[PDB]
Structure 1
């Protein structure tokens, strides 16, 4: 149900997300190479990818991840690590909807995700902008898994519009705001949002919709099981804000499903 090239991208960015969890990639020196223990990120190691900016424990809520320059794919990637520390975890629990009119009118965002991003937005905005300046033909992709995908999604919407497109691939990310935000993210221009969910990962199902949360459209639903490898016939495209049929179904959610997005993700020591 997906082009081989979309499939290829989906995998490449699942490994960049994965790579953000690896400890050594969070305090790496600029210019060294992105590598992963285990085989967390073979493709990324295969490419000519080097650290532009490595950050850890930044702003509020322990914002951690890296900014890499991929010369092989002509890419400027900003990957956010998902949840690992306790501050990451406390921050996810600020689930009250904060108001993010600056981003869009009527739009309300999950508090913590927004606060974390807002607390590190300038520094990162500028690191991305210098990057683009030096490699203006390169493509800017923001990515991440779970909390990292939420971060990537709001940073994405926040920075789109300064003369460089921003594509966002998110894996197993939770809802990030009200329906106003959901509609906004669905339509924004200046790059694409790729919202990838896996079977019944519990994470894309929170916060509940009763708290006033929604999901943007569409959703690329990976339907092959945990530990089995993904092919392009497994990824299905589900359309419509708060659509059911994809991940969003009335049934028992699962935890380990969240850990399997093309390969093991989030478990990188």
Structure 2
């Protein structure tokens, strides 16, 4: 639940987190005035992904919690990528969440999730539920058909900021529906309550208070947090609780040293995201962008 134990990582584990940071950052070409061109052209950021075919990019701007992103296939790594991101600017989204009522509602309210799947006390931020709903409404069917077209391809869901919260929720939806997804989130805010947090921990790790110390070959959930980023501590409300397991960038900038990317134990950790202080909490946006690569920008 709350520990202070941290663990160092491999260069392979580092490259794995940076890969998903890059893929999550690519989601920012999907907005207006920019686009990802087929097969996968978005400036030389997409160049790190030479074996990727873009299926469909999507965007909905009518609600603050509305989502944009892309669906793509990786022919080399044999994977289906679902990258989610909040349509609206990081500032308008961060401030709304940061300085507002964060009302919780039961998760089985959302599409493709029923009472048998979730616990009764599995409560989630109502806004993030709309973020998840918007994702499905825009890409659920297309993804289901792509899953049929590539049945041996592993599904990987990623997102930064609000997109991270939507990636976690979409990730649980696939996990619960007989699929086996990889969920990598970057700077994701707190999604639900203790009931949701402990349910996700059982879903992805098999038990409560799990051992989330090692990058396993079989591990499917990763929550990437950074020094000074206030977003993974938002909402500040007591009802909100993170699931395990945190991956912490204990470095002020992008491209951190291998030694400064740590594996955090527990749902809250004083040595990691939970220990963020006032002075490390000055560059609200600045700190939210630094996840291996500077997030929120695409060629």
- TM (norm. structure 1) is 0.87
Tell me the SS of whatever aligns to 1:176.
Answer: coil
Distance 2:125 2:45 in 1: 30
Distance 2:91 2:161 in 1: 15
User: Within 5 Å, which residues of 2 pair with 1:31-46?
Assistant: 32-37=38-43, 39-44=44-49
Distance 1:237 1:87 in 2: 28
Residue in 2 that maps onto 1:182: 197
> Out of 59, 62, 67, which is 1:63 matched to?
67
Residue in 2 that maps onto 1:49: 52
Cα separation, partners in 2 of 1:59 and 1:163, compared to 1, 3 Å: farther
Cα separation, partners in 2 of 1:86 and 1:15, compared to 1, 3 Å: closer
Residue in 1 that maps onto 2:76: 72
Contact 2:36 2:42 in 1 (8 A): no
Cα separation, partners in 2 of 1:99 and 1:141, compared to 1, 3 Å: same
Residue in 1 that maps onto 2:118: 104
- TM (norm. structure 2) is 0.79
> Out of 234, 239, 248, which is 1:221 matched to?
248
Cα separation, partners in 2 of 1:85 and 1:200, compared to 1, 3 Å: closer
Tell me the SS of whatever aligns to 1:188.
Answer: helix
Q: After superposition, what is the alpha-carbon deviation per residue over 1:115-161, rounded to whole angstroms, capped at 9, x for unaligned?
A: 22124425523222211211122110000000100000011112213
Relative contact order: is structure 1 or structure 2 higher (C-alpha 8 Å, sep ≥ 6)? 2
User: Within 5 Å, which residues of 2 pair with 1:1-269?
Assistant: 1-23=8-30, 28=36, 32-37=38-43, 39-44=44-49, 47-57=50-60, 60=63, 61-82=65-86, 84-85=88-89, 89=93, 92=97, 95-101=102-108, 102=114, 104-105=118-119, 106-189=121-204, 192-210=220-238, 212-227=239-254, 229-249=255-275, 251-252=277-278, 253=281, 254-255=283-284, 256-268=286-298
Paired residues in the alignment total: 262
Distance 1:7 1:240 in 2: 20
Structure 1 alignment gaps of length 5 or more? none
